[PDB]
Design a protein around this motif. Sequence first.
Motif, PDB file in Angstrom:
ATOM      1  N   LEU A 141      29.552 -18.690   9.930  1.00 26.62           N
ATOM      2  CA  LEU A 141      28.857 -19.420   8.875  1.00 26.62           C
ATOM      3  C   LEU A 141      29.004 -18.568   7.630  1.00 26.62           C
ATOM      4  CD1 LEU A 141      26.881 -21.401   7.448  1.00 26.62           C
ATOM      5  CD2 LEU A 141      25.086 -20.512   8.903  1.00 26.62           C
ATOM      6  N   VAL A 142      29.814 -19.034   6.691  1.00 26.96           N
ATOM      7  CA  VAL A 142      30.411 -18.181   5.678  1.00 26.96           C
ATOM      8  C   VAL A 142      29.901 -18.609   4.313  1.00 26.96           C
ATOM      9  CG1 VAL A 142      32.554 -17.535   4.582  1.00 26.96           C
ATOM     10  CG2 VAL A 142      32.437 -17.672   7.051  1.00 26.96           C
ATOM     11  N   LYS A 143      29.253 -17.695   3.608  1.00 22.36           N
ATOM     12  CA  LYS A 143      28.900 -17.961   2.224  1.00 22.36           C
ATOM     13  C   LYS A 143      30.141 -17.852   1.353  1.00 22.36           C
ATOM     14  CE  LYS A 143      25.853 -16.480   4.002  1.00 22.36           C
ATOM     15  NZ  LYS A 143      25.297 -16.789   5.342  1.00 22.36           N
ATOM     16  N   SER A 163      31.569 -16.256  -1.432  1.00 23.91           N
ATOM     17  CA  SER A 163      31.163 -15.016  -2.082  1.00 23.91           C
ATOM     18  C   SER A 163      31.488 -14.989  -3.566  1.00 23.91           C
ATOM     19  CB  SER A 163      31.846 -13.835  -1.406  1.00 23.91           C
ATOM     20  OG  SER A 163      33.225 -13.850  -1.700  1.00 23.91           O
ATOM     21  N   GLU A 164      32.564 -15.650  -3.981  1.00 21.95           N
ATOM     22  CA  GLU A 164      33.030 -15.534  -5.353  1.00 21.95           C
ATOM     23  C   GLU A 164      32.324 -16.484  -6.306  1.00 21.95           C
ATOM     24  OE1 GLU A 164      37.267 -14.176  -3.579  1.00 21.95           O
ATOM     25  OE2 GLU A 164      37.191 -16.053  -4.711  1.00 21.95           O
ATOM     26  N   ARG A 165      31.452 -17.350  -5.803  1.00 20.55           N
ATOM     27  CA  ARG A 165      30.694 -18.266  -6.644  1.00 20.55           C
ATOM     28  C   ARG A 165      29.343 -18.496  -5.976  1.00 20.55           C
ATOM     29  NH1 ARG A 165      35.273 -18.970  -4.457  1.00 20.55           N
ATOM     30  NH2 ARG A 165      35.762 -20.702  -3.043  1.00 20.55           N
ATOM     31  N   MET A 197      30.370 -22.527   3.459  1.00 20.59           N
ATOM     32  CA  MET A 197      31.303 -22.923   4.498  1.00 20.59           C
ATOM     33  C   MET A 197      30.630 -22.854   5.859  1.00 20.59           C
ATOM     34  SD  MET A 197      34.832 -21.019   3.572  1.00 20.59           S
ATOM     35  CE  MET A 197      35.174 -20.424   1.924  1.00 20.59           C
ATOM     36  N   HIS A 212      37.962 -29.414   5.091  1.00 19.87           N
ATOM     37  CA  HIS A 212      39.302 -28.941   4.775  1.00 19.87           C
ATOM     38  C   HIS A 212      39.862 -28.229   5.995  1.00 19.87           C
ATOM     39  CE1 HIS A 212      38.470 -29.575   0.435  1.00 19.87           C
ATOM     40  NE2 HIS A 212      37.275 -29.113   0.752  1.00 19.87           N
ATOM     41  N   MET A 245      42.095 -24.860   7.126  1.00 22.10           N
ATOM     42  CA  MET A 245      42.688 -23.554   6.841  1.00 22.10           C
ATOM     43  C   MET A 245      43.203 -22.988   8.154  1.00 22.10           C
ATOM     44  SD  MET A 245      41.405 -23.601   3.647  1.00 22.10           S
ATOM     45  CE  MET A 245      39.880 -23.760   2.741  1.00 22.10           C
ATOM     46  N   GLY A 269      43.107 -32.660  -0.442  1.00 22.41           N
ATOM     47  CA  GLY A 269      41.714 -32.249  -0.635  1.00 22.41           C
ATOM     48  C   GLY A 269      41.643 -30.762  -0.285  1.00 22.41           C
ATOM     49  N   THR A 270      41.654 -29.908  -1.307  1.00 24.43           N
ATOM     50  CA  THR A 270      41.736 -28.469  -1.090  1.00 24.43           C
ATOM     51  C   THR A 270      40.765 -27.740  -2.003  1.00 24.43           C
ATOM     52  N   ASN A 271      40.075 -26.753  -1.442  1.00 23.08           N
ATOM     53  CA  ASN A 271      39.113 -25.916  -2.147  1.00 23.08           C
ATOM     54  C   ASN A 271      38.957 -24.623  -1.351  1.00 23.08           C
ATOM     55  N   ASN A 272      37.891 -23.870  -1.653  1.00 22.18           N
ATOM     56  CA  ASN A 272      37.277 -22.861  -0.776  1.00 22.18           C
ATOM     57  C   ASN A 272      38.194 -21.667  -0.485  1.00 22.18           C
ATOM     58  N   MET A 273      38.522 -20.926  -1.541  1.00 17.94           N
ATOM     59  CA  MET A 273      39.299 -19.693  -1.431  1.00 17.94           C
ATOM     60  C   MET A 273      38.426 -18.541  -1.927  1.00 17.94           C
ATOM     61  N   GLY A 274      37.638 -17.968  -1.019  1.00 18.51           N
ATOM     62  CA  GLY A 274      36.633 -16.959  -1.338  1.00 18.51           C
ATOM     63  C   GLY A 274      36.933 -15.657  -0.594  1.00 18.51           C
ATOM     64  N   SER A 275      35.995 -14.712  -0.678  1.00 21.42           N
ATOM     65  CA  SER A 275      36.132 -13.426  -0.008  1.00 21.42           C
ATOM     66  C   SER A 275      35.083 -13.224   1.081  1.00 21.42           C
ATOM     67  CB  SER A 275      36.080 -12.283  -1.021  1.00 21.42           C
ATOM     68  N   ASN A 276      34.390 -14.304   1.469  1.00 20.36           N
ATOM     69  CA  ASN A 276      33.708 -14.479   2.761  1.00 20.36           C
ATOM     70  C   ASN A 276      32.564 -13.481   2.993  1.00 20.36           C
ATOM     71  N   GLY A 277      31.487 -13.661   2.227  1.00 18.62           N
ATOM     72  CA  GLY A 277      30.238 -12.931   2.483  1.00 18.62           C
ATOM     73  C   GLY A 277      29.450 -13.604   3.612  1.00 18.62           C
ATOM     74  N   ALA A 278      29.968 -13.472   4.827  1.00 14.82           N
ATOM     75  CA  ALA A 278      29.431 -14.209   5.960  1.00 14.82           C
ATOM     76  C   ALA A 278      28.182 -13.545   6.516  1.00 14.82           C
ATOM     77  CB  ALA A 278      30.482 -14.329   7.062  1.00 14.82           C
ATOM     78  N   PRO A 279      27.334 -14.354   7.151  1.00 17.03           N
ATOM     79  CA  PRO A 279      26.139 -13.842   7.819  1.00 17.03           C
ATOM     80  C   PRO A 279      25.808 -14.759   8.986  1.00 17.03           C
ATOM     81  N   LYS A 280      26.076 -14.291  10.200  1.00 15.90           N
ATOM     82  CA  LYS A 280      25.819 -15.069  11.401  1.00 15.90           C
ATOM     83  C   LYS A 280      24.510 -14.654  12.052  1.00 15.90           C
TER      84      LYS A 280
END
Lengths: 210, 147, 163, 183, 202, 194
Positions: free
Chosen positions: E121-123, E125-127, E132, E175, E177, F183-194
């Motif tokens: 479960l992914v925030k 991060s860049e905005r 996600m 989407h 990936m 339909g494309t988006n969501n290119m981040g650096s993934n500050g995930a928290p499970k």
Amino acid sequence: IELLNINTWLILQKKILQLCIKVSRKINDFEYVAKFSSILITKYTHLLNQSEQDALFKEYIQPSITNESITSYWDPFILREVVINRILDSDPTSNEIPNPQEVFNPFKAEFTCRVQNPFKFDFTINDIQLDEEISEFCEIDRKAVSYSGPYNVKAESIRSITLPLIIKKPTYKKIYEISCLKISILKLPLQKFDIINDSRRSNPVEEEAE
Amino acid sequence: PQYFAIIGKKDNPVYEIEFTNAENPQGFPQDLKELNPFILHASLDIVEDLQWQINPTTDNCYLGKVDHFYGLAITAYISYSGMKFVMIHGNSANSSVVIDDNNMRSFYQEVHELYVKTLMNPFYKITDPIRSPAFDSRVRTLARKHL
Amino acid sequence: MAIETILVINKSGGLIYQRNFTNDEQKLNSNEYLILASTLHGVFAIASQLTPKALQNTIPYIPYVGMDDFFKEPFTNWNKSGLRQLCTDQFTMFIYQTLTGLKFVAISSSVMNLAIQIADNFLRKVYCLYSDYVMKDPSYSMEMPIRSNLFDEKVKKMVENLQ
Amino acid sequence: RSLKAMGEEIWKNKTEKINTELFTLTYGSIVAQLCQDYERDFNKVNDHLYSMGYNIGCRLIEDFLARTALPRCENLVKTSEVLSKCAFKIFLNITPNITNWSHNKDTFSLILDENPLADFVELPMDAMKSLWYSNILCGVLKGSLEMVQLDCDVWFVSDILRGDSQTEIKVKLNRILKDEIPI
Amino acid sequence: TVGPKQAITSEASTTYIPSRIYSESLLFKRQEASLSAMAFLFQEMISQLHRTCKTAGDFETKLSDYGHNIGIRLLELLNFRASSSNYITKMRRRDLKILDILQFIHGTLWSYLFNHVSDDLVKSSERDNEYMIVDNFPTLTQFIPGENVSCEYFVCGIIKGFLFNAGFPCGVTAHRMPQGGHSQRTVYLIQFDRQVLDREGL
Amino acid sequence: GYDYDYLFKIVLIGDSGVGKSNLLSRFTTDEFNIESKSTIGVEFATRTIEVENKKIKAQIWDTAGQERYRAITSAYYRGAVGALIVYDISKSSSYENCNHWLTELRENADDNVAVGLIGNKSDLAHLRAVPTDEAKNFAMENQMLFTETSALNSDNVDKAFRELIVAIFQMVSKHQVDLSGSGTNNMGSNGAPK
């Protein structure tokens, strides 16, 4: 009336604008007692009784009837359909008008009326009693109009309108459609009270001089 | 007398009842016609204000006496979809919901079970009233046996 | 034993699938495969009708082909008066009719009765992938070539698990 | 060994497993929208659930015949044996038994004990006479058995969603037609 | 004839015990089915919604409505049977912070529909205002070939109607990936609206 | 590769010697590598047209009558979706059993077929065994496309095939919507928290 989105819960909307009718009665404003008596037509479907404050609300309607134009017939849902059935005169005169290649694929009304008379029928939506109408006739059309208008309509029923007795002049056969007529419900003649769920067309042409 | 109502999402009602003691059979004398829905719709708002407060004015489902007006207290329950189970209590003297506060928490949970049981019908949309003959007996036996 | 080309033909003649596996050559233009598939359907019809003074039990086993697997128990076949296996010098052609009428053809580049036993336990494991990955496919109408691209690399893994 | 005990081996290992409450909910969503866009014309939604269910069974008979390798059934009482112990036992989790054959074994009936498609449904009063809710099975059992060239005709007769006694399905089969050239 | 909207029925308390007409049950009774019998009904969703649709976008947003009418049912069931009726309990927290309902959907909705908990479960991060939720294997869309992901949206409408009836107006978009050896990874991004965003600040 | 979308099978049926095979060679790809006719019976020919931005592949199976293959032909009409009864205007006894061919082909072909009717050898128009208006009428109350082919001009038969594949297309035209995939988006650096 802005605090509730009137123009959800329903009992309070009825009770607040019933209070608005009574305050505009005690003030004796006329244009708002006409306006809220006309905006009660969103809610006569549910929430009402069969002719108790329909008649005790008709005593608020009829002062606005006897004033100048302040109601102008709220509901444009009157006549279900109109039938222009030519009655039987005589069957002597209907008077009408007039392999090499070649692949064949099986896979791939207007009237000419005469001297007779039509029919109309309609209903009233709510149980206010003895709603009256006079002088229904056509809009921008030819001579093909009715004559006499002594009719009322009852409580809820879908009522016949007998004796329209049309008289027309002959034209050319240019095919136009009528939909509705200029009907006056106990007051001034209002506009095209069109038909429910479809325009529900009719298609006349000329009278036959032949 | 007791007034009970299930208020929907847009504040449209889906269940509407009163039930009262046989000493005064025609319950709520000249309030049931003219104040009893207004105080309900007016005091939806403090229940709505209390739905985003972590601690009130670690359960957050039962709510206490949230308003007291002419000596009539109301009690509330905010369900998970947001249908709020607000109920007005009336008496002769100052009525106490504190004598039933341990009790009628299991009246709100035992009507929320009936709301969940009538949600699962796929023919039942949202924003339409509960036209169920079973629901009346299932709420008034609960009102008779547990008050 | 071995398989070099999967051919899947319809219940009405012409084929719906073929994928030459490591053939590295194209002897037949794509159009020819259709007349080959219809020729196999025709000789499968003809091999019913000639049968000598016979008019009188195909029970395979589990050999663990492909490395849980798809089935456990001996079973039956469904065609008796019909073509079952051609045998020549360069290749050897197996064929397998389902009950509904959907023949599976496997051309084999390893030549020279036990090859039937190892063959139909592979040709039922391609039938299970057909019924799992082409039947549940709303873009796939009936009676149409298999344009799905999941069916290719679900069967490629099992055949390179064989050979 | 036999058909009663064989299907629960298939039910025991290598059957990919899902809940039934999602299955009830996703059937109920379909039939609620089919009610709402056909303006409560309930003899039309029985036709539309029939035409939906007929295209399931032609895709389903290949999955059943690949999951277990039956022969053709020799008589119509053993088609009912398959439809008892190995059709609905593998795909669903229910074993609906058979009563009430005809005077000559032309029809039969199928008592369905619990339904895994109506766990919550209380259908409305204008649908209480003209709708059968689990009509999707009567598209399936017409469909798949037509691909085995058993031209049957299958209806509902009564069901507990109406408030009647029991859910049962009457099967009347006419001809074996013709089948692929080898047998 | 119990609640008409014409009136509130006034009825006295402590009447007789009436007859008992319909009684149901609400615990889980974990009854299984076969994935073929699910996937056949999912392709019979899509085999009619391909037929009665003109362009792609209205097909997207009326495949979503079927998921909406499972999400607004399932929100009231799952908390109520996770907090555990006539075996009287103490009720659940009724969560009201955006990363306290995302933990609930991530650990309980996916463990309810599917056997496993969803993996990550992914925030974003860049905005802000993208969140996600991923898996590694969508087990309902796994029989669809190709790459176009319109057939995803029946599960994403289950997400959206979960939150739209929870007081959190959002909008999901799926989407794909293909990261690593998981070629069908299939992110959903939940994307909350602006008018919710001030309220959790205050 | 292959890259077509649908594939129909269309039988050509008639009596022997009515001229079906010479009719088949002129209008379509032919003699690719087919072994021949009569060796297995019912030769197969292919035609590739496109309808409505879908590619259509049609296989034409000219049925052969030799009495010996009569049992074999029955199995070959299984699954047959398009059909064409051919008759010649010079000889007359083919039309006596043309109705029999229609009856046998309404049997065990599909649930629904689209049968055309074609008059070969109109080069011998003067030698007309049967009037064209009677066959035109018999096509009209049997829902059949009707053609008269010179055998020296291929335009008529080619037009017939195009319209037959249209009518059999819309019959099976499965609804399709779109495969756009944008339909494309969501290119981040993934500050995930499970």
